[PDB]
Paper text:
As an iron storage and release self-assembling protein cage, wild-type Ftn (wt-Ftn) comprises 24 FTH1 subunits with 12 C2 axes20. With the ultimate objective to create a biocatalysis platform that could be expressed in vivo, we report the rational design of an artificial human ferritin heavy chain (FTH1)-based metalloprotein to achieve histidine-specific aza-Michael addition with α,β-unsaturated chemical moieties. Utilizing the large area the C2 interfaces cover altogether, mutated FTH1 subunits were designed to assemble only upon divalent copper binding at the C2 interfaces hosting their histidine mutations. To still allow these sites and/or structurally induced nearby residues to chelate Cu(II) for catalyzing histidine modifications while allowing the ferritin cage to reserve its self-assembling property, instead of modifying all of the above-mentioned four copper-chelating histidines, we attempted to replace only one (R63) or two (R63/E67), which are noncopper-chelating, with histidine analogs 1–3 (4-thiazolyl-l-alanine, 1; 2-(5-bromothienyl)-l-alanine (BtA), 2; 3-methyl-l-histidine (MeH), 3), separately, via genetic code expansion.
The cryo-EM structural models of Ftn-2X-2 and Ftn-2x-3 and these two Ftns with CuCl2 supplement were solved and revealed two detailed metal binding environments. In fully Fe(II)-bonded Ftn-2x-3, S59/H60/63MeH at the C2 interface and E27/E62/H65 binding sites are identified. In a comparison to the ICP-MS data and structural models of Ftn-1x-3 and Ftn-2x-3, the E67MeH mutation displays dual roles in aromatic ring stacking and metal chelating in controlling Fe(II) and Cu(II) binding.
Residue numbers in the entry:
A (entry chain V), B (entry chain C), C (entry chain L), D (entry chain D), E (entry chain A), F (entry chain N): 5 to 176
The structure:
């Protein structure tokens, strides 16, 4: 056992590894979206920039989880990062909706992780989750919901002008 | 009687208290509007910012009236601040129209207050109203009328693109 | 249901609305106190400044709660803001004691809110309360207790010199 | 009872006093270590500096706990600060291992304190512990584990060159 | 077909997609190494920093390849990013040797890509590879060879002092 | 024997260890006083600040004595730091009188130490005491005497206004 390990349950360690994989997968999905909007037949540059920034943030989250795993004496076990569900995201609105769904899935995973940590009486893990992930997820979900609402009201995806103007004014 | 009270009629004091309550109520209505536009299913951030600023200004007006009440030797009697008429303001255009109606109501109350002060031969109160409230109300009414006209001409509330672009370009 | 709503119980939403009303009421009470000390027959300017700052802070707390309600997909339902219990607060010491009682009531409401959020397994709400409200309430209660102790030891409210010197040296 | 006391159990107060004594004892142990490495027959100046800084930090932790005790209306009851277990710490590696053991003991005490606060439904105390002590303890334990690992791999304590170079390069 | 596609063979597009996957896999391997050296029982911080920087650079290479794919009218097809071959890299020297092997594999893949582009008479692709990847790979291979040589000469991996001093002086 | 030891008698070493314990005890007493005045039912913040500064200075004195012990080749032997005589110091005036008594006790111990060093013909120890401790003690005793005189003349401890004004004007 690790010399620094204290009040760190094996189930918590396994759940942390699963969360690391999930964050990496989310980063990969965002990368796919970003370079979808970089295509010459899509050409929505600020959508691409937004999703690239999201990918970078997801990577940062994964990094922080790995650092936590090392801090508590757990051992990182990396797994395959599955490819995203789609290659063609079909519109800015569809990409935003998919991102909202992904963020809610990540939030649900984090909530299950917090429940596990509470059941295992690991207050440090609970505080780590609350401080670094829960509010970030809530803010991200709210922002994506706002984006989806605005895109729908402007007339997307049928109205290409709507997505162009949202690209310029909101994401620009 | 207050040692500083001079040429301050009881009717003027009561009307000032009523005006204080009205200004607080207007601030509360603007707060309700602002956080209506902060909703994820509305998501018009500059509308929310505009109405929050209006709420802040109404609060300042109430504060100034209370300071006047103390200056003249009157006694402040606070009353319940009634909740706004609506929880859902249904659109940017509807909110702007409601704000215009509210500002005209406040202006009418201020005009009645000025008439009372003139009838009571209280030139300090008349000058206070004219200097601090009447022109501010006229400017606010003109601005809200301009906003309503522009929103109607752009196609609001049916055209969501109209409200989005007004949010960005005029209120932004 | 709101597209952003996740792990947000209806009971939590209702309790948040009640807390919003309570914070607004506390701001209104502090406003009443502040302008009581602005009276010509009281004339304790730093007491007025202190209570005005407290009113502003309570308003900020209410605003933050409304923002949280929107973030989680809940719906804000505003209610009447009841007028404060007293128009005449009768002394600096009495006002400080009333403020201490009010802050302890708000703290108890926040503790009940935290208990509800814990029972509903809403870690984001629990963390929000702990991060933004609990320590602020503890600090405010401690500060008001210190003020009350100092005023009592100096001889307030019978000794007007005590309240004058406390106004100058502590609140100044 | 204290006028500011609210939702503060007597058991929590007693546990806080015990934790204050433990933090003071840890500071005293670190002081002993630091001045052990200041000896002419040991002469590892950066080891002494490191342990002096640790003693200072432990003192800060004790101070923060006493401030918390006063904030919540509890009463501080100081006890004797027992002398450290050893006068001669025998090596840099042995001192680091003893510091790791001490930090893990302090962490276990803090975890028991958090469990008690959770059982007593004192969310402010739980948040205080999580925000100010748990992550600091985890980081300290990880750092001491890293130091112990590096010292062991370099050949300490038999290799004096190892401790000299660790003194210069890591602690310097 | 893409409106911007010109002199871009399908085989080149497929090879570019394979290279993108390879660069992502290399970044993932470097990430695994970096957090291996962050472990409390390894504790070689500059090794971790070095491999984290390498992971970041590999990610940048992948990004540049995806940008090229979009520029030429090709379509990005992402695949699973396989997990690294090892979880425990067993030493700084072993990690450096594995990194050298990985970089030589990437270089061989790039050379095959250049051969394919030359066979397909795609001078833009050839120039892209030469300008952005070939010299970077040569420099990386030379640097890793230097690191391996120095670690072997210092006595690694048996001599822990060797790896500590290399961590401090070369990677620091 | 230590390689640096020269003209350092064992009795001097023992007396230095006793003085180290006494300085630590004085720091602990001052800490107790400081946090007594931080209580919500005492609330004399500048008294608390003054006694905290005194505790810090006593700690510095202890540190300097330990450094001297190491410089001369003596060996530091730490003992238990006894808890202060009182938990409740009952007033600012009583705390000041107790501090005066404590400082005079420390001064008497230092004078006995100087007498011992003179009897042992250790001029370095005598000069150390004279340069670093004797004048500091005289100044501290004079300052505490001035504080006690002023508090008594102002009407403390019966007059709470006296202690409040002394807190503000002298200790502020
Ligand atoms: Fe990325
Ligand atoms: Fe994430
Ligand atoms: Fe407002
Ligand atoms: Fe107004
Ligand atoms: Fe206010
Ligand atoms: Fe509040
Ligand atoms: Fe210290
Ligand atoms: Fe500590
Ligand atoms: Fe990376
Ligand atoms: Fe590469
Ligand atoms: Fe101290
Ligand atoms: Fe001293």
């Amino acid at each position: 056992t690790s010399q620094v390990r204290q009040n760190y349950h094996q189930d918590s360690e396994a759940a942390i590894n699963r969360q690391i994989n999930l964050e990496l997968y989310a980063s990969y999905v965002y990368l796919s979206m970003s370079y979808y909007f970089d295509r010459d037949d899509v050409a929505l540059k600020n959508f691409a920039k937004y999703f690239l920034h999201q990918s970078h943030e997801e990577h940062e989250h994964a990094h922080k989880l790995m650092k936590l795993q090392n801090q508590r004496g757990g051992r990182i076990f990396l797994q395959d990062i599955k490819k995203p569900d789609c290659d063609d995201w079909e519109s800015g609105l569809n990409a935003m909706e998919c991102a909202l769904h992904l963020e809610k899935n990540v939030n649900q995973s984090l909530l299950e992780l917090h429940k596990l940590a509470t059941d295992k009486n690991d207050p440090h893990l609970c505080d780590f989750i609350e401080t670094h992930y829960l509010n970030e997820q809530v803010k991200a979900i709210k922002e994506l919901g706002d984006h989806v609402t605005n895109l729908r009201k402007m007339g997307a995806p049928e109205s290409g002008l709507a997505e162009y103007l949202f690209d310029k004014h909101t994401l620009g």
